[PDB]
UniProtKB/Swiss-Prot annotation, chain D:
The protein's name in its UniProt record: Transient receptor potential cation channel subfamily V member 3
Protein task: Non-selective calcium permeant cation channel. It is activated by innocuous (warm) temperatures and shows an increased response at noxious temperatures greater than 39 degrees Celsius. Activation exhibits an outward rectification. The channel pore can dilate to provide permeability to larger cations. May associate with TRPV1 and may modulate its activity. Is a negative regulator of hair growth and cycling: TRPV3-coupled signaling suppresses keratinocyte proliferation in hair follicles and induces apoptosis and premature hair follicle regression (catagen).
Residues of the full protein shown: 694 to 756 of 790
Family: Belongs to the transient receptor (TC 1.A.4) family. TrpV subfamily. TRPV3 sub-subfamily.
Disease: Olmsted syndrome 1: An autosomal dominant, rare congenital disorder characterized by bilateral mutilating palmoplantar keratoderma and periorificial keratotic plaques with severe itching at all lesions. Diffuse alopecia, constriction of digits, and onychodystrophy have also been reported. Infections and squamous cell carcinomas can arise on the keratotic areas. The digital constriction may progress to autoamputation of fingers and toes.
Organism: Homo sapiens (Human)
Cytoplasmic side: 1-63
């Protein structure tokens, strides 16, 4: 207070490298301004004193383009880490200013404080902004939540959808669904304005398109099946399947056209789609893009076949059989219109990556190790009986050990070995490791996976479902996008007509006199 | 018994069948016509034959010969072992794990539902 | 303390702060610098690192008489000290020991299997 | 713990000259005529704010 009274500059900019680090654990960033340091360090008395000073430019930007509100989003953390003080500083500085100039400001990367919060992953600050109530009339126009009407415990709120819905370029909803750099997206879509916004896009157009995409892809695989399974095997199959050749027949002709077109359609779409996200890390493609590759692979294997038919060698068949077996197993994608089968699909994904790949790795080191050890003992068969043994080679022993593990076939211990008790020793040893321990251990580790993942599979499902809704939404034309536009136009203040989202609530606990509202006549119309 | 069928089995049986019939026709599509010398050259000679034999593997019954008169044997093995990993390793054992979650939650309510 | 297994007394010594200047030289933890919530501490490594004969780190890892070693290596000066030895030389040697032992078994295999 | 045993057994094998360059810590002046080897670890703490009175260097950051 002394230094300010003596004429200290209250708008300095500490722009040094320590004040603009590149690795948290290289320094400390706060926004470079004295007001931001007092706010980012939980000093409310100094934050108030600086705002009351008349030369304090609260709307000042810095090297990163960040103003006072951008910086608080940068330093915020979850509740167990810090406290709720960043949220409280966010409120104090915004109310004292008294306008939309700060939240409207975009940084050098082209981001508002709202968009910046969705990117960096600060759910607590989002939940504050997206549901902000300022009951103080003379500051009610600074809100995003508005009580339309309330009669007793029943109330109706309005949530502004200015830069949350996908009507603009870079919305909160789009950042939330497509941000592969964070690990808490499935908490974000729980927030009420987004959650209701997903559910309505489903009820209107995304549900129906999901059923159509199923049907086109469903008949697509049936056609691949029948041209293949009922191929002209005899004649050495010169009139290859998918040919568009001799005369017609209205099922023979229709089917083979629909495939080669829809094959290219996926290849272009998934050719574009795989290119846009540009796989950076490994956890993303597994968690955000796996089904996009198999359809790219499934489509290219057809087109690879469609070349090799009349142009080159006879391995076209191998590419076509992979296309269908890949195609039919992919159908687990379209389970995600349903919650029950969708959550079930989420668990299949997890259990493979946490249990199976660990399992298959260790099992193979045993399978091939005991295999060559048992094959190395088998003498040459006498010329009388050529089939003296089933472990006569590496590939033969590895197969028979595989058969034992799956419970198929018979087991004769007399295999023309030099050392039978030693021969039994390696075999029974293999059983104890595989049959007794590893297989049963695998079941036990799944139970631990199912227990932990069951508490999160529902919200991860809505994340994957949310990606499906928006991708449908990016396809629709302009005229069809407009009629399925969300929200209704409401007058939340004087000459402030905004698009908002009506959500009804029932609250019984903390009764109060409803003083702030928009319409004194409750109910619709 | 009532709960575990509706929460685990019908989810399970649905996904298992999409694999059983999908890998079935894929493996049957590769089998050449048998030479006239030996009519029983293969057990995957048709759709219904392949779907049955894959069912036998899952329940652990019978024998398994990889020589089935196929054009592409390494490709033929690839689909078969792929079917085992999805069914034998993952889905069957995953089914046991999901029951344990069902038994845990339902055990706290089965007495009152009984009454 | 490292021998007899007293983790609470270790955690005190290994991270002791005496803020009272005129007794600050009796410390083992030292605040090098602090600006706001960011701080940088210095942990003395006199008889903790393996530069000497019988160090705290060596007792912690090789004491077969106790049953709480895996709590001890959670303590910050030791934990960071393990991670840095890995990043510099122990990680690379672990990869080499793998390679020599990996080709060692392949040779035993082939002289035998192709005998 | 098992990993720690592996690191030290490797460390007991290295020669003297190679042991010295991979020596840990930097030499710091923690007090008057008390030069010690120490280990730098950075922390971020938000809860109990205070006036930082005890320290070694008033100019924060590296170097
Ligand atoms: C007015 C009638 C419509 C007018 C014409 C508008 C034309 C709009 C044009 C849309 C795109 C057309 C080209 C296809 C895009 C290529 C992708 C592909 O092959 O599969 C597509 C097939 O799934 C679909 O849904 C597309 C079929 C047309 C949509 C239905 C009309 C619009 C909704 C009508 C309103 C209904 C509610 C009405 C209630 C009143 C996308 O499927 P996917 O699963 O996303 O992609 C597969 C890959 N993935 C799984 C890895 C993601
Ligand atoms: C993935 C993570 C796991 C990593 C663990 C790695 C393992 C580590 C430990 C390994 C232990 C060491 C074993 C190998 C060394 C000895 C081999 C030898 O002597 O020569 C053999 C070379 O091999 C072949 O020719 C292979 C033939 C196919 C059988 C094996 C396939 C199993 C793959 C597993 C399934 C999934 C594979 C998935 C990936 C492709 C010669 O073969 P043969 O039989 O004599 O052929 C000629 C005779 N014949 C006419 C009778 C045919
Ligand atoms: C079954 C065992 C008990 C099960 C319980 C498991 C626990 C015990 C596990 C024990 C591990 C191994 C058990 C192998 C079983 C006997 C096999 C055998 O005798 O093979 C052959 C000998 O060939 C050999 O190799 C004999 C064993 C060598 C030593 C094994 C122990 C390691 C000691 C190494 C020193 C380092 C250690 C030093 C201390 C630090 C003879 O067998 P055969 O040919 O079938 O006989 C028919 C006769 N015929 C040849 C005329 C045709
Ligand atoms: C329910 C929830 C799950 C839904 C999943 C959906 C599946 C998705 C994936 C689908 C993959 C695609 C496979 C089908 C398409 C190809 C078929 C083809 O080419 O023609 C075949 C038509 O089929 C038959 O004739 C059927 C004969 C019986 C075998 C199948 C029964 C098992 C059903 C499952 C058991 C439970 C059923 C319960 C309900 C009834 C021709 O048959 P064929 O063999 O050539 O016969 C003549 C030759 N013969 C003389 C040698 C015999
Ligand atoms: C993970 C563990 C398992 C999971 C469980 C799921 C397992 C799914 C797997 C199921 C079995 C798979 C094999 C079946 C196909 C072989 C058919 C065949 O060849 O035989 C006969 C045809 O049969 C048909 O055409 C089949 C008709 C449809 C199946 C009806 C029963 C479904 C189950 C109902 C019960 C449950 C329903 C639910 C409520 C109670 C005749 O054969 P053939 O005469 O020797 O030769 C054929 C020549 N011919 C056609 C010219 C005559
Ligand atoms: C076993 C594999 C390792 C297992 C580990 C699993 C991981 C790897 C999984 C791999 C997936 C598939 C593996 C199949 C195994 C080989 C089969 C084969 O060669 O069949 C035949 C070729 O026919 C083919 O179809 C060759 C493979 C085509 C490409 C497959 C990958 C997709 C690339 C598409 C581009 C899209 C992607 C582009 C990038 C975005 C030949 O085999 P055969 O006939 O038995 O040989 C005997 C010779 N004979 C013909 C003279 C009689
Ligand atoms: C300048 C270059 C080096 C100069 C020469 C120095 C020579 C130093 C001499 C070391 C010992 C040499 C003899 C072998 C000891 C016998 C033990 C054995 O069989 O396996 C050994 C093989 O594993 C190894 O790592 C040894 C290979 C040499 C180490 C690499 C050079 C030094 C580090 C370079 C820095 C790289 C990073 C650089 C970044 C800038 C130890 O493996 P293990 O797993 O401990 O023991 C197996 C049994 N156990 C599993 C039951 C415990
Ligand atoms: C549920 C899970 C399994 C689903 C799999 C699908 C069902 C089973 C599939 C088929 C029945 C198999 C029995 C033989 C009859 C084949 C007829 C045919 O068209 O054959 C041609 C293929 O035709 C095409 O590829 C045209 C593509 C569009 C229509 C496909 C037919 C089924 C569509 C709706 C299906 C309902 C799906 C549900 C709809 C919502 C070529 O073959 P063909 O030589 O002319 O055939 C006669 C040969 N025969 C005389 C030797 C017998
Ligand atoms: C052309 C070859 C086709 C061969 C198959 C044809 C027959 C069809 C067979 C198989 C396809 C059907 C199985 C998948 C079913 C749906 C998905 C599911 O259930 O969960 C997972 C399946 O798990 C994986 O994808 C794990 C990786 C190995 C899978 C092996 C089969 C397919 C790839 C073969 C290798 C080719 C490699 C060759 C080089 C490119 C989803 O995948 P994920 O993303 O890994 O899991 C996300 C985990 N998360 C929740 C933590 C985020
Ligand atoms: C071949 C393999 C096929 C691929 C897998 C197929 C999946 C297996 C099939 C069925 C599983 C059934 C399980 C019970 C569902 C109850 C839970 C639920 O979410 O209900 C929803 C179902 O109502 C809808 O309208 C949503 C789904 C419609 C789009 C699906 C089209 C594509 C799949 C067509 C497949 C059919 C053909 C299947 C046979 C070919 C309720 O509506 P909602 O709007 O979501 O509101 C949520 C309200 N709630 C949460 C409070 C309840
Ligand atoms: C091989 C021979 C036979 C073929 C096998 C094929 C089998 C598949 C056949 C058909 C497709 C079904 C696939 C499974 C769908 C998921 C199940 C489901 O949602 O369960 C839910 C139970 O609550 C219910 O309401 C489930 C009962 C609806 C189906 C009734 C039987 C009709 C289907 C025919 C089946 C009966 C006849 C049997 C024969 C077909 C549990 O889901 P959840 O996630 O816990 O949430 C639910 C709501 N909750 C939030 C309030 C708790
Ligand atoms: C028989 C024929 C096939 C061969 C079978 C042999 C299979 C093995 C093949 C090869 C060696 C791999 C062995 C398993 C490695 C450990 C798994 C692991 O880390 O799991 C972790 C998740 O999952 C992953 O981290 C793995 C996903 C990335 C790899 C993608 C597949 C490529 C490898 C090829 C496989 C795909 C293609 C399929 C075919 C090869 C879970 O671990 P966690 O402890 O929870 O901690 C993780 C991080 N966390 C702390 C943030 C949570
Ligand atoms: Na069995
Ligand atoms: Na069996
Ligand atoms: Na059997
Ligand atoms: Na349990």
């Amino acid at each position: 207070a002394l230094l300010i009274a003596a004429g200290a500059d209250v708008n300095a900019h500490a722009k040094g490298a320590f004040f603009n680090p590149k690795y948290q654990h290289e320094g400390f960033y706060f926004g470079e301004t004295p007001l931001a340091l007092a706010a980012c360090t939980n000093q409310p008395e100094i934050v108030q004193l600086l705002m009351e000073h008349e030369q304090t430019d609260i709307t000042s930007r810095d090297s990163r383009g960040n103003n006072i509100l951008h910086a608080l989003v940068t330093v915020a953390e979850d509740f167990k880490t810090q406290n709720d003080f960043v949220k409280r500083m966010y409120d104090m500085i915004l109310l004292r200013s008294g306008n939309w100039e700060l939240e409207t400001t975009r940084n050098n990367d082209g981001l508002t404080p709202l968009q910046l919060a969705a990117k960096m992953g600060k759910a607590e600050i989002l939940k504050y902004i997206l549901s902000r109530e300022i009951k103080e009339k003379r500051l009610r126009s600074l809100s995003r939540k508005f009580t339309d009407w309330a009669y007793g415990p029943v109330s109706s709120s309005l949530y502004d959808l200015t830069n949350v819905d996908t009507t603009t370029d870079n919305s909160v909803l789009e950042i939330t669904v497509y941000n592969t750099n964070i690990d808490n997206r499935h908490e974000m879509l729980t927030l009420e304005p987004l959650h209701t916004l997903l559910h309505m896009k489903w009820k209107k157009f995304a549900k129906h398109m999901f059923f159509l995409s199923f049907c086109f892809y469903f008949f697509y695989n049936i056609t691949l099946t029948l041209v293949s399974y009922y191929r002209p095997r005899e004649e050495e199959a010169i009139p290859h399947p998918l040919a568009l050749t001799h005369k017609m027949g209205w099922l023979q002709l229709l089917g083979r056209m629909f495939v080669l077109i829809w094959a290219m359609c996926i290849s272009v779409k998934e050719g574009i789609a795989i290119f846009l996200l540009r796989p950076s890390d490994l956890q993303s493609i597994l968690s955000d893009a796996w089904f996009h590759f198999v359809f790219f692979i499934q489509a290219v294997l057809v087109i690879l076949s469609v070349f090799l038919y009349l142009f080159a060698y006879k391995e076209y068949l191998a590419c076509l059989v992979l296309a269908m077996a890949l195609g039919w197993a992919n159908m687990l994608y379209y389970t995600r219109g349903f919650q029950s089968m969708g959550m079930y699909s989420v668990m299949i994904q997890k259990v493979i990556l946490h249990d199976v790949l660990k399992f298959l790795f260790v099992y193979i080191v045993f399978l091939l190790g005991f295999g060559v050890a048992l094959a190395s003992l088998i003498e040459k068969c006498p010329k009388d009986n050529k089939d003296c043994s089933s472990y006569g080679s590496f590939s033969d022993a590895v197969l028979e050990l595989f058969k034992l593990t799956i419970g198929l076939g018979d087991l004769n211990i007399q295999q023309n070995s030099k050392y039978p008790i030693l021969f039994l020793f390696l075999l029974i040893t293999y059983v104890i490791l595989t049959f007794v321990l590893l297989l049963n251990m695998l079941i036990a580790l799944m139970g631990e996976t199912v227990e932990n993942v069951s508490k999160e599979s529902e919200r991860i499902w809505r994340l994957q479902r949310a990606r499906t809704i928006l991708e449908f939404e990016k396809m629709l034309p302009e005229w069809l996008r407009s009629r399925f536009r969300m929200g209704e136009l409401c007058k939340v203040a004087e000459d402030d007509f905004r698009l908002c989202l009506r959500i009804n609530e029932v609250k019984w606990t903390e009764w109060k006199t409803h003083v702030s509202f928009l319409n004194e006549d409750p109910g619709p119309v």
